[PDB]
Structure formats: C-alpha cells, structure tokens
CSV table of N, CA and C in Angstrom, one decimal:
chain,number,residue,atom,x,y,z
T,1,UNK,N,0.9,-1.2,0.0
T,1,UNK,CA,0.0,0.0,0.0
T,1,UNK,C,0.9,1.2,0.0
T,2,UNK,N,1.1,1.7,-1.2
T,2,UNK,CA,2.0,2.7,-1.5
T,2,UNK,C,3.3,2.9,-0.6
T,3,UNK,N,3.8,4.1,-0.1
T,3,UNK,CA,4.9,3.9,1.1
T,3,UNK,C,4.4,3.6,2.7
T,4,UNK,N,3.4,3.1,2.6
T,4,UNK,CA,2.9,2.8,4.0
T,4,UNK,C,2.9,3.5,4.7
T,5,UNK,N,3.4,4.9,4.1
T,5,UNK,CA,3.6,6.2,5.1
T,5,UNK,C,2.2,7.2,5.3
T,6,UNK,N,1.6,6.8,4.7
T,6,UNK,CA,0.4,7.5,3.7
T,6,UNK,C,-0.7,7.1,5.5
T,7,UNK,N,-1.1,6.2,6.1
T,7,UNK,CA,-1.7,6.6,7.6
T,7,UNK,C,-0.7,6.7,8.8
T,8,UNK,N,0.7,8.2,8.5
T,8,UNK,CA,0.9,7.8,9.7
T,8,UNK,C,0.3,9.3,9.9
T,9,UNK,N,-0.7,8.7,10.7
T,9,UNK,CA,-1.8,9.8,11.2
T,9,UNK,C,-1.1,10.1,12.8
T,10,UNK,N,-0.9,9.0,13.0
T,10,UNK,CA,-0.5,9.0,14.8
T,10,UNK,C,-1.8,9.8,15.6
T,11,UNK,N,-2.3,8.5,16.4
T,11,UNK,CA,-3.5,9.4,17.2
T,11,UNK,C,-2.8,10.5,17.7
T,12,UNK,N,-3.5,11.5,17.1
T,12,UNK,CA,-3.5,12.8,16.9
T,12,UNK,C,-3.9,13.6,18.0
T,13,UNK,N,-3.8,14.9,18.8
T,13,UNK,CA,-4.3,15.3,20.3
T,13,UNK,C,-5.3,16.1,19.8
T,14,UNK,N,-6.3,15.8,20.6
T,14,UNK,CA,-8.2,16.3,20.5
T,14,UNK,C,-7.8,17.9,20.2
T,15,UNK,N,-6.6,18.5,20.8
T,15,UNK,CA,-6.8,20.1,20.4
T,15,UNK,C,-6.7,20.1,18.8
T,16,UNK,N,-5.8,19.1,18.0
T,16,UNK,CA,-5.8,19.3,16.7
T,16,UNK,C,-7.4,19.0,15.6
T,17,UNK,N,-7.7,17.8,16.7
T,17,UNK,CA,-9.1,17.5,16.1
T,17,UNK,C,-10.2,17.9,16.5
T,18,UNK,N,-9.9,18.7,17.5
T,18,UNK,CA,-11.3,19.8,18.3
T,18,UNK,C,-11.1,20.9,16.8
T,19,UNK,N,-9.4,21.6,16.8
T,19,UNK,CA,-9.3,22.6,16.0
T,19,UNK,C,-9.3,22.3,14.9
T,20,UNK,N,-9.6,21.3,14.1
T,20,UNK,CA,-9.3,21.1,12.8
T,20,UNK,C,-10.6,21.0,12.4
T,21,UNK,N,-10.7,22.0,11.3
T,21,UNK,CA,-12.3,22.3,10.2
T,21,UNK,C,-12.4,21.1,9.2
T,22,UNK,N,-13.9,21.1,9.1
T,22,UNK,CA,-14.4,20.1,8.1
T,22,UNK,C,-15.0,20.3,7.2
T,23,UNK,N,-14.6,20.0,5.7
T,23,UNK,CA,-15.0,21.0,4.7
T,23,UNK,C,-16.1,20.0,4.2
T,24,UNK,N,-17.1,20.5,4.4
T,24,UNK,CA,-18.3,19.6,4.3
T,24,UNK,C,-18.6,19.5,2.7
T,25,UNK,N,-18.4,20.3,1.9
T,25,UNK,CA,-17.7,19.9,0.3
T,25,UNK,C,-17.4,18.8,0.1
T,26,UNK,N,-16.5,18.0,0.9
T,26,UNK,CA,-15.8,16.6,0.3
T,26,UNK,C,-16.8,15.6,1.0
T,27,UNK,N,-18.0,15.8,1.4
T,27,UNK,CA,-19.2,14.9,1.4
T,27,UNK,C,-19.9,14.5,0.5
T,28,UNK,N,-19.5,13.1,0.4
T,28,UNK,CA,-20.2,12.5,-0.5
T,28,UNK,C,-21.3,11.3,-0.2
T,29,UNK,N,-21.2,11.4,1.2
T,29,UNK,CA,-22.3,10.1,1.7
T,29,UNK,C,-22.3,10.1,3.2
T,30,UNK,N,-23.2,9.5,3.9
T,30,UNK,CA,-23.2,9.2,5.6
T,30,UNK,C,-22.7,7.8,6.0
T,31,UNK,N,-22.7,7.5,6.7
T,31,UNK,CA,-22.3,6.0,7.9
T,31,UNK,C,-23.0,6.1,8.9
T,32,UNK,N,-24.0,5.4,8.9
T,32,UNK,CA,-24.7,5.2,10.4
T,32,UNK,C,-24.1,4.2,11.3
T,33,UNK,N,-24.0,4.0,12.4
T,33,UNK,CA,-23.8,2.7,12.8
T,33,UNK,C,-24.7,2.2,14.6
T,34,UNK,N,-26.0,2.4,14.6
T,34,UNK,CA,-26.6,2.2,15.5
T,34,UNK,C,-25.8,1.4,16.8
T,35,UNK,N,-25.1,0.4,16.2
T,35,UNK,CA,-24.7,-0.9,17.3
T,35,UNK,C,-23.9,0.4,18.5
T,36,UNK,N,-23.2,1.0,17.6
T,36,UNK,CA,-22.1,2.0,19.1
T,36,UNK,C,-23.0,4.0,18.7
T,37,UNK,N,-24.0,3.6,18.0
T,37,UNK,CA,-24.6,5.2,18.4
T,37,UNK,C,-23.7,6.4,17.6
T,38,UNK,N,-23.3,5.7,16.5
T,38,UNK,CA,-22.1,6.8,15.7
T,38,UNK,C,-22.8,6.9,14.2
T,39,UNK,N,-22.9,8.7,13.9
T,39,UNK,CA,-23.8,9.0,13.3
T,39,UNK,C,-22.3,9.7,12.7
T,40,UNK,N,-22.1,9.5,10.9
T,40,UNK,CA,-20.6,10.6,10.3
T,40,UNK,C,-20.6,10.4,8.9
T,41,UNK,N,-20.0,11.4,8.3
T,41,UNK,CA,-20.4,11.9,6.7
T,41,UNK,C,-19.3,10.9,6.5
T,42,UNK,N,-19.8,10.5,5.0
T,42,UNK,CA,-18.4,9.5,4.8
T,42,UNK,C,-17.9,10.8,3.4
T,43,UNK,N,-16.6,10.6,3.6
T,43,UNK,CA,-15.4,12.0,2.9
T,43,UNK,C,-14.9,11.2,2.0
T,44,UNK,N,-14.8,11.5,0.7
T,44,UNK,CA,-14.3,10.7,-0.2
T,44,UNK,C,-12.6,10.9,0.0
T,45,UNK,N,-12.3,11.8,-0.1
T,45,UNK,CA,-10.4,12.6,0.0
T,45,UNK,C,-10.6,12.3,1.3
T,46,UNK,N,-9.1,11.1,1.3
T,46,UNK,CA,-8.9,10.5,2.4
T,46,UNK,C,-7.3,11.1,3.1
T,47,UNK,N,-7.6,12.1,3.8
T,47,UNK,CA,-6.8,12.9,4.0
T,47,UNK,C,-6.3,13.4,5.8
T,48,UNK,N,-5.1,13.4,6.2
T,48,UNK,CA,-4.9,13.7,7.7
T,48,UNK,C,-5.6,14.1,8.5
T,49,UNK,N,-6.7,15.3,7.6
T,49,UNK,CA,-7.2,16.1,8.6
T,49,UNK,C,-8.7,15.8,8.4
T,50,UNK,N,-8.9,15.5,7.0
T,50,UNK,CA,-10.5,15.0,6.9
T,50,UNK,C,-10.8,14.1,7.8
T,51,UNK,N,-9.6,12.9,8.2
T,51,UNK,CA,-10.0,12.0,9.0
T,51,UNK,C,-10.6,12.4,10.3
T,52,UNK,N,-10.1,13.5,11.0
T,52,UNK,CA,-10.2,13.8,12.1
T,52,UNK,C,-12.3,14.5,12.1
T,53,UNK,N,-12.6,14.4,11.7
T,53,UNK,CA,-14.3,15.3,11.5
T,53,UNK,C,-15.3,13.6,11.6
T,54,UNK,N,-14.9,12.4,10.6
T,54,UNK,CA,-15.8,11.8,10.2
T,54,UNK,C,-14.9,10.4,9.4
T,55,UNK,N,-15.3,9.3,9.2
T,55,UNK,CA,-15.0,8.4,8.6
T,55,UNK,C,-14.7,8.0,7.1
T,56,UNK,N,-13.3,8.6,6.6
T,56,UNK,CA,-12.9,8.5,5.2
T,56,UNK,C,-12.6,7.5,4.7
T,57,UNK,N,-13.1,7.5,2.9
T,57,UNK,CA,-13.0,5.9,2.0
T,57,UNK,C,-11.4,5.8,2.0
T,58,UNK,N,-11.2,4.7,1.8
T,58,UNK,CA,-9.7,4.6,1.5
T,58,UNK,C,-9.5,4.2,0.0
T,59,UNK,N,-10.1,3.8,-1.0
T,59,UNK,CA,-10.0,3.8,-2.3
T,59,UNK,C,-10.2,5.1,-2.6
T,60,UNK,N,-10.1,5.4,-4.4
T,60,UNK,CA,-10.5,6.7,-4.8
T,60,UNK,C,-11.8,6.5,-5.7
T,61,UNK,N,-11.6,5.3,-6.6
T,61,UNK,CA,-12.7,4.9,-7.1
T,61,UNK,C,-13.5,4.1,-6.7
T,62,UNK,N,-14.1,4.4,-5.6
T,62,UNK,CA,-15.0,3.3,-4.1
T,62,UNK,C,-16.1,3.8,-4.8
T,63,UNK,N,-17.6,2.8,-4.9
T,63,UNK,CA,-18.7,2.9,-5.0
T,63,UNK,C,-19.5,2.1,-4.1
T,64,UNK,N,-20.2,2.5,-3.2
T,64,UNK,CA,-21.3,2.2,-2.5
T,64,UNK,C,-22.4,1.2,-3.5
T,65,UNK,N,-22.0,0.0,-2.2
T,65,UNK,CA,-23.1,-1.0,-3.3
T,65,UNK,C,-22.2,-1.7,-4.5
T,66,UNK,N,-21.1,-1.3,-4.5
T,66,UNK,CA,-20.2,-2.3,-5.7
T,66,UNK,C,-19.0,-2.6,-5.0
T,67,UNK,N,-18.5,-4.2,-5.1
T,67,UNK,CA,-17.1,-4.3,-4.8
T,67,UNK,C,-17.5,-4.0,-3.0
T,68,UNK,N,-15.8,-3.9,-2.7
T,68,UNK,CA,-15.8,-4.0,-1.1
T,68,UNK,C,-15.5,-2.7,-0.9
T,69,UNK,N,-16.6,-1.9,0.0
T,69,UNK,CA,-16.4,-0.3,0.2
T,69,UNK,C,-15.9,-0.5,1.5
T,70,UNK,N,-14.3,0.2,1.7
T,70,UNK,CA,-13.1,0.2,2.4
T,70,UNK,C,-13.9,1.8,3.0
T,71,UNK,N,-14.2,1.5,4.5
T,71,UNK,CA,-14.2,2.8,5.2
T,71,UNK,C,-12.9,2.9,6.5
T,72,UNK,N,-12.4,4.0,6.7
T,72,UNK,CA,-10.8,3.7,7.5
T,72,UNK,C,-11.6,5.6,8.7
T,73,UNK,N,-11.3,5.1,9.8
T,73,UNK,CA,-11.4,5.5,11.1
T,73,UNK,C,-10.6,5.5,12.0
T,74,UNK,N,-10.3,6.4,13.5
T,74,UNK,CA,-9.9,6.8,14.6
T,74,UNK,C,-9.9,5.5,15.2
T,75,UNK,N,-9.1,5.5,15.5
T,75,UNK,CA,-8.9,4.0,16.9
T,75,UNK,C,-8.4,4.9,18.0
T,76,UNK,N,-8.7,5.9,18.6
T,76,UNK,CA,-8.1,6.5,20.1
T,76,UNK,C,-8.3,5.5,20.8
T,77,UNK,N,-9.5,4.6,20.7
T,77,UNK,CA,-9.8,3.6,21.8
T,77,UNK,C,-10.9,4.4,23.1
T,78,UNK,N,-11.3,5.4,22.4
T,78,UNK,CA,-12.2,6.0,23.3
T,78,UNK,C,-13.6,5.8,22.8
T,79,UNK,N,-14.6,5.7,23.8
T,79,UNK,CA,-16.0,5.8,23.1
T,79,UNK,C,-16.3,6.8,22.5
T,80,UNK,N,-16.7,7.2,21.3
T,80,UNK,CA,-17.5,8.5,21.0
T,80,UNK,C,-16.8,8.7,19.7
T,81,UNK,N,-15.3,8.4,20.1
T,81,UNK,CA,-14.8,9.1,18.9
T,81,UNK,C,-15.3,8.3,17.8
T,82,UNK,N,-14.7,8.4,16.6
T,82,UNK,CA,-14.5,7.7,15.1
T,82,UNK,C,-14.2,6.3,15.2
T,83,UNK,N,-14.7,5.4,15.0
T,83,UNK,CA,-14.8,3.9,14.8
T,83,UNK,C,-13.7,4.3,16.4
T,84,UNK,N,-14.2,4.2,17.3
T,84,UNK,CA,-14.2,4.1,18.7
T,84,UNK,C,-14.1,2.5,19.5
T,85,UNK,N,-15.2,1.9,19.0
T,85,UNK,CA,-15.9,0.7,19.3
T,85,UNK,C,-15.8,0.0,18.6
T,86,UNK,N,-15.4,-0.2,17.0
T,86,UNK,CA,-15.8,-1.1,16.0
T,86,UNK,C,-15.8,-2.5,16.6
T,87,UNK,N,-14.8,-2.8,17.0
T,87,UNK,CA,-14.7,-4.1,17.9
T,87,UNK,C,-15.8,-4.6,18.9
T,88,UNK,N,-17.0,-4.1,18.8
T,88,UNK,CA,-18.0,-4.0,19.8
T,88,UNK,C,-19.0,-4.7,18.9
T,89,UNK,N,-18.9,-4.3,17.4
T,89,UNK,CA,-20.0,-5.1,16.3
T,89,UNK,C,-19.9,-6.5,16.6
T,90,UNK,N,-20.7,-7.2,16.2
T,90,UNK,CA,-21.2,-8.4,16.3
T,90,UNK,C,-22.1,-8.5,15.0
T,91,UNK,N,-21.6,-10.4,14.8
T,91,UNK,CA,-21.9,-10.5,13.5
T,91,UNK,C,-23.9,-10.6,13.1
T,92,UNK,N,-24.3,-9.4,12.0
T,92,UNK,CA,-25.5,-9.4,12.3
T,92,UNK,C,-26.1,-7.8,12.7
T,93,UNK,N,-25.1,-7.8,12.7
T,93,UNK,CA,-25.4,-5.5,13.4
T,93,UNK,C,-25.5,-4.7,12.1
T,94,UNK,N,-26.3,-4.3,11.7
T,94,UNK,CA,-26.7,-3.4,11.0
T,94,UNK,C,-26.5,-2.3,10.8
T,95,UNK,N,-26.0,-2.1,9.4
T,95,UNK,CA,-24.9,-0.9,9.3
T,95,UNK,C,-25.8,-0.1,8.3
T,96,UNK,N,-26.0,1.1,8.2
T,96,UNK,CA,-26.6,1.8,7.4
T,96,UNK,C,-25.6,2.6,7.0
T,97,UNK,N,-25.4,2.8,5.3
T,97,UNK,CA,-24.6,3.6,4.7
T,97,UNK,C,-25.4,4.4,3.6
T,98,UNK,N,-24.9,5.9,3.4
T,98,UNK,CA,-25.4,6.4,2.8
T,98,UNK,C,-24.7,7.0,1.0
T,99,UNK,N,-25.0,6.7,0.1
T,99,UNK,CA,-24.5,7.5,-1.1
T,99,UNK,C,-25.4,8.4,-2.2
T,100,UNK,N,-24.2,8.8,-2.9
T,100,UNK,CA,-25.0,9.8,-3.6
T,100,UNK,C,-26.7,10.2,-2.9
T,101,UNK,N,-27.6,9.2,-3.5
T,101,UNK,CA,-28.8,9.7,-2.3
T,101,UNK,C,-29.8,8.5,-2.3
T,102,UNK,N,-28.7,7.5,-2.1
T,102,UNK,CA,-29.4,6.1,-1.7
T,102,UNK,C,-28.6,5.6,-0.3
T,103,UNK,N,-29.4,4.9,0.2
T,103,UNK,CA,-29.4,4.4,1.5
T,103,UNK,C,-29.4,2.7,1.3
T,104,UNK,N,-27.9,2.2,2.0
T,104,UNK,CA,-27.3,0.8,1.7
T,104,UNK,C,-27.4,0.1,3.3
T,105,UNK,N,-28.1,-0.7,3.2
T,105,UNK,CA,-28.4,-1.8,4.4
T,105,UNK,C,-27.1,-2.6,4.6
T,106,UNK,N,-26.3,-2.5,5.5
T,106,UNK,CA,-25.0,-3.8,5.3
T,106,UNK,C,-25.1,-4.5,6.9
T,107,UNK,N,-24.7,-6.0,6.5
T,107,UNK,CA,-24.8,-6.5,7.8
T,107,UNK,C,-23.8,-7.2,8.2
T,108,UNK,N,-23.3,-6.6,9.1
T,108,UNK,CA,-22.0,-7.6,9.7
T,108,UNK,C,-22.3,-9.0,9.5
T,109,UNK,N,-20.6,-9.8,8.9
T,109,UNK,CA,-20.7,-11.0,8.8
T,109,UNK,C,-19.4,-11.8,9.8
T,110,UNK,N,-18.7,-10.9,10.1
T,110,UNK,CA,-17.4,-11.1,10.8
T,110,UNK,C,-16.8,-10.3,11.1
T,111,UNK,N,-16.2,-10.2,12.8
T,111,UNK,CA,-14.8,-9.2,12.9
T,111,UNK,C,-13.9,-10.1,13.2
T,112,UNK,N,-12.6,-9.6,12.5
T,112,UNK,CA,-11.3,-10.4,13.4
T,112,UNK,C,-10.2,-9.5,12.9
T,113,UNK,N,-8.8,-9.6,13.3
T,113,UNK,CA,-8.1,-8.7,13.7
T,113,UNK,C,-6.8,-9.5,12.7
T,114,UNK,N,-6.0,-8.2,12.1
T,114,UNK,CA,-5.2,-9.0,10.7
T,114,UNK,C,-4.1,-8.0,11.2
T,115,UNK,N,-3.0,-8.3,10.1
T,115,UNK,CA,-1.9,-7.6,10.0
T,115,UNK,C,-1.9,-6.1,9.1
T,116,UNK,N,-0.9,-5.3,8.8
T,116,UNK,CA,-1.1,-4.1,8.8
T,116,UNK,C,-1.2,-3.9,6.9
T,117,UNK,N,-0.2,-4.9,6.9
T,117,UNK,CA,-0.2,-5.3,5.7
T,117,UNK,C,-1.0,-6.3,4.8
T,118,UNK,N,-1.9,-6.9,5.4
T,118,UNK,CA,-2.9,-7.7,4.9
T,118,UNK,C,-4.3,-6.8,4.4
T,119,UNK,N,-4.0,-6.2,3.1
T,119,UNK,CA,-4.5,-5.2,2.4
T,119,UNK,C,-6.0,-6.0,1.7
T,120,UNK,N,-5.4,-7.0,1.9
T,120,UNK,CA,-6.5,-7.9,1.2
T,120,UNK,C,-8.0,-7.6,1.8
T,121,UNK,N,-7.8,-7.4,3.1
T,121,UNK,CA,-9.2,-7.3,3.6
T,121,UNK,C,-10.0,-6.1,3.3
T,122,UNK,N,-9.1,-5.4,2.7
T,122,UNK,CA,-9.6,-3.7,2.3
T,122,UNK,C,-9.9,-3.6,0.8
T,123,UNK,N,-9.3,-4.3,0.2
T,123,UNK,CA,-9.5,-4.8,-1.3
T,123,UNK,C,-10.9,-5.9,-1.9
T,124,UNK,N,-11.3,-5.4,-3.0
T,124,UNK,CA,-12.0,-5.8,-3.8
T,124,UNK,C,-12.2,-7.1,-4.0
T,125,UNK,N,-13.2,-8.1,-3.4
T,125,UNK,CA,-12.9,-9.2,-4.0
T,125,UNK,C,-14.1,-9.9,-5.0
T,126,UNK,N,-15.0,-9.1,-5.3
T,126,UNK,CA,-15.5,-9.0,-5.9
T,126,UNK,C,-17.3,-9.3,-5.7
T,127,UNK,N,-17.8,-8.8,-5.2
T,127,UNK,CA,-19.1,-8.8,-4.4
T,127,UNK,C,-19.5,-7.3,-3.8
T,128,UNK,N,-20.8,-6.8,-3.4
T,128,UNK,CA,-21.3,-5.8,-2.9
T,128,UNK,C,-20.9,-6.2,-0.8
T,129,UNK,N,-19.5,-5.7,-0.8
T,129,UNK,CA,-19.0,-5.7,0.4
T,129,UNK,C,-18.6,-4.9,1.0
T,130,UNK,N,-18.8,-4.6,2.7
T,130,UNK,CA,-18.0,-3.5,3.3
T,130,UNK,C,-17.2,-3.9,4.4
T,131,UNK,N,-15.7,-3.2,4.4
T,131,UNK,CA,-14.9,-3.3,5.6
T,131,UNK,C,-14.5,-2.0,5.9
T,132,UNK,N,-14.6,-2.0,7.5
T,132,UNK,CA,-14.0,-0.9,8.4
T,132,UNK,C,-12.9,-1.3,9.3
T,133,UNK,N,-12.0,0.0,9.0
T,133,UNK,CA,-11.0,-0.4,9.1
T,133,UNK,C,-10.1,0.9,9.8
T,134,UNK,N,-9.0,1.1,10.3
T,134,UNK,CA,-8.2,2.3,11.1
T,134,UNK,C,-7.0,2.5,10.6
T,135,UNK,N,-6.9,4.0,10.5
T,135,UNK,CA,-5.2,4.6,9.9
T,135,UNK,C,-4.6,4.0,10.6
T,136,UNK,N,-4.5,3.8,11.9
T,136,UNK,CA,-3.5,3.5,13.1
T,136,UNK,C,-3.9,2.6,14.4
T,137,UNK,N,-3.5,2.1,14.6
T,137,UNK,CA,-3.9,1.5,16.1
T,137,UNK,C,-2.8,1.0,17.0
T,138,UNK,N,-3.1,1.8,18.5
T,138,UNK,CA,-2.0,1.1,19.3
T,138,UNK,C,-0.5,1.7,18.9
T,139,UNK,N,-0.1,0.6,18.2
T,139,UNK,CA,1.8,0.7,17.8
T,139,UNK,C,1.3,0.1,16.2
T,140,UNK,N,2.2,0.7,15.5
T,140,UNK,CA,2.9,0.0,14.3
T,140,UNK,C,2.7,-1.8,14.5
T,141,UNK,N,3.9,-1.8,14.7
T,141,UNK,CA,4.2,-3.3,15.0
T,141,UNK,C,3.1,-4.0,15.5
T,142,UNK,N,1.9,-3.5,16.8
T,142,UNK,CA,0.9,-3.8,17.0
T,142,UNK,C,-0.5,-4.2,16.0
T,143,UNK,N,-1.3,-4.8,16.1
T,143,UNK,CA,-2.6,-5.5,15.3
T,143,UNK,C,-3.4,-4.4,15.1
T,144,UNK,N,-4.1,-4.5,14.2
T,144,UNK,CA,-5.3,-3.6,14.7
T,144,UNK,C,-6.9,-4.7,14.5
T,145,UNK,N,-7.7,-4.2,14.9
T,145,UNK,CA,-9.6,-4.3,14.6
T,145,UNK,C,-9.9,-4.4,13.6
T,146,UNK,N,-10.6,-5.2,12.8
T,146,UNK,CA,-11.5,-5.1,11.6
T,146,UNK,C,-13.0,-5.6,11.3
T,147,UNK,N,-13.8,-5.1,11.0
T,147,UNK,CA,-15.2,-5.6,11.1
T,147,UNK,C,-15.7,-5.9,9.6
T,148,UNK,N,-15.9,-6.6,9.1
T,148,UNK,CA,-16.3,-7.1,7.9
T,148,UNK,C,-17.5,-7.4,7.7
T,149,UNK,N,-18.5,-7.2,6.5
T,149,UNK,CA,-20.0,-7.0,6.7
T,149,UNK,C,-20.2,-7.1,5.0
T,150,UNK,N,-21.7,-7.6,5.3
T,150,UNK,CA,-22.4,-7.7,3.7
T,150,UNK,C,-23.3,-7.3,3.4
T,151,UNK,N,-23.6,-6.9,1.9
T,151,UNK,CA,-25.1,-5.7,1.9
T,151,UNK,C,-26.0,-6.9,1.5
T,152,UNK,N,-26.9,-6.3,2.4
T,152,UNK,CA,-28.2,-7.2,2.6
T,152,UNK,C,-29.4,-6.2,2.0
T,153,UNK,N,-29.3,-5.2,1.4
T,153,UNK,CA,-30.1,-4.5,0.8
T,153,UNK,C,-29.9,-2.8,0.7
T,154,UNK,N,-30.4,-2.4,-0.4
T,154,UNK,CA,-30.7,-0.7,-0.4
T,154,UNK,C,-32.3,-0.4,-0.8
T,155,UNK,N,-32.4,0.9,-0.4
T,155,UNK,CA,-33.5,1.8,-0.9
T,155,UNK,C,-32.9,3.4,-0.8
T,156,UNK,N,-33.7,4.0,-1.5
T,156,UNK,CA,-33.5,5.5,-2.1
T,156,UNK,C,-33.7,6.1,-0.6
T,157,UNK,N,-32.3,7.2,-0.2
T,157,UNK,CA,-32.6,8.1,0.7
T,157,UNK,C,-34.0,9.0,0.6
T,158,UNK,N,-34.9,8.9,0.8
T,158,UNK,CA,-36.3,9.5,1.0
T,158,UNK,C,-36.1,10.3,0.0
C-alpha cells in the first residue's frame, strides 16, 4: 500500500481535532452505525485532517453498493470518537450507509483482527462488500480491529 507512510496519522491530540475544520464539500455520503450510536459523513479525500471530523473511504474509485467499500477511522480507543468501538459489532449489526442519495443496508458478517499489511481485507474481492477499518492503532508493530460486513439491501434516501 504505496509507502505505508500514507496513515501515519498517529493518534493525533483532540486540540488538533477539536481545531481542525471540516470541509463539508468533500461529502459524499453518511455512515450510520446504531450498534455504538455513531452518526458521520463519509469523505471521499482521504486525508490527515478529513479523518479527524468523520470516517474517510480509502479507495478513490469506491462505489457504495459495488465491490468492497473500504471505510478507515480513529482508533483513540475512546467511546465517541470515530470507529471508537468497531470491535464492539457483532456479527448481524446493522450498518446503514449512505450514497449519492441512496441508503445501503450492510450486515455484519465477521470481525477479526489482521496484519497491517494484509490489504486484502480492504481490497476488492468482488461482491457488494463492506470493511472498516483504522489509519492507526495502538503501535505500528501492534494488530489492529477489523469488522467485515455484507449488503443485505438498499433503498433510495427518502
């Protein structure tokens, strides 16, 4: 995954992410996630500082509803924040995502926890799939969280 340098986000200190603006322009969709109560625009430009507002794609050519839509989030390890909890889903939790102006049902099928470099799970394998996933977690050398999930339906945002 290019120079690998590309998430070193390093949990970042809440004054940079209290102070850092969100240019609500690079909204291109929502992420619901009822199971931990986290309501966030999904940001197509997946960028240092976008991350810090809401949950950015990690492809460039990601489509909602095609292929496996790679969403990448905050691991502070605190409740509230940005994929905070992910590790809290359970398979069967009900993910509501939003695009252009349709509204995608995904349902957890699996979490389990991979290497940094096991890109695969963020990659396309060909099906209407979603994985969440974190710039950072912990240490480098450390594991991170992954929740893995399948669309079980859409309908048109109202």
């Amino acid at each position: 995954g290019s120079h690998m340098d590309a998430s070193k986000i390093d949990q970042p200190d809440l004054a940079e992410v209290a102070n850092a603006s969100l240019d609500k322009k690079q909204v291109i969709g929502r992420i619901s996630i009822p199971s931990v109560s986290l309501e966030l625009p999904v940001l197509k430009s997946s960028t240092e500082k976008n991350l810090l507002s809401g949950a950015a794609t990690v492809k460039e050519n990601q489509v909602m509803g095609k292929g496996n839509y790679a969403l990448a989030g905050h691991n502070m390890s605190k409740k509230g924040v940005l994929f905070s909890d992910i590790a809290s889903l359970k398979k069967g939790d009900k993910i509501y995502l939003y695009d252009n102006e349709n509204e995608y049902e995904y349902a957890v099928t699996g979490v389990s926890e991979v290497t940094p470099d096991k890109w695969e799970v963020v990659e396309d394998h060909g099906k209407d799939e979603i994985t969440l996933i974190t710039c950072v977690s912990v240490k480098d050398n450390s594991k991170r969280y992954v929740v893995a999930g399948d669309l079980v339906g859409t309908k048109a945002k109202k």
